[PDB]
Amino acid sequence: LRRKAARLVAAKCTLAARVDSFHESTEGKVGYELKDEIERKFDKWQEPPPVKQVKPLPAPLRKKRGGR
RNA sequence: GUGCUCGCUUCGGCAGCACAUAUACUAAAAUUGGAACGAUACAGAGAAGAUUAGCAUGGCCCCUGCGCAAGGAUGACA
Numbered sequence: 565l566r567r568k569a570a571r572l573v574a575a576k577c578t579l580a581a582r583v584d585s586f587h588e589s590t591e592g593k594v595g596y597e598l599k600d601e602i603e604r605k606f607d608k609w610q611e612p613p614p615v616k617q618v619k620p621l622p623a624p625l626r627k628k629r630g631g632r
Numbered sequence: 633g634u635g636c637u638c639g640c641u642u643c644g645g646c647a648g649c650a651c652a653u654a655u656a657c658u659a660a661a662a663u664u665g666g667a668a669c670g671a672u673a674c675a676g677a678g679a680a681g682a683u684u685a686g687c688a689u690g691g692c693c694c695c696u697g698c699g700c701a702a703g704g705a706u707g708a709c710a
Contacts, residue, residue, distance in 0.1 A: 630685045 565609050576602055 576598045583594045 625682080628684070629687090631687065 568609070569606060572602060572605060 580595050580598055583589055589595070
């Protein structure tokens with residue numbers, strides 16, 4: 565997942581650098597929000613897979629079409 | 633029942649004494665009931681997909697027609 569993470573980190577770093585180039589969000593709210601988003605998307609990737617049901621065999625046993 | 637008491641008493645007998653101490657589904661007999669996957673009778677392919685014919689829909693690519701929206705380039709003297 566490291567390249568998928570690197571793309572996201574690069575995008576959010578571009579956003580933070582554009583934020584900082586005008587010296588706005590001096591205290592650091594935007595960076596904290598972007599880091600929180602990055603961490604949440606990282607946890608989503610590593611979140612354990614959902615519970616998935618087993619499909620039983622249908623039945624051991626009707627008209628059919630015909631054309632081109 | 634056997635044997636014995638110095639007993640009564642006679643060998644005909646009697647009274648007492650030691651040993652014997654608790655088997656058995658008990659059973660010979662009573663009766664009326666319910667009963668095959670054994671035979672004959674029938675069936676017996678005792679293991680298969682339980683199908684294949686059209687048309688329309690759905691996907692992709694052109695072509696043509698009509699409509700809607702937004703446009704491009706061009707043409708016309710008396």
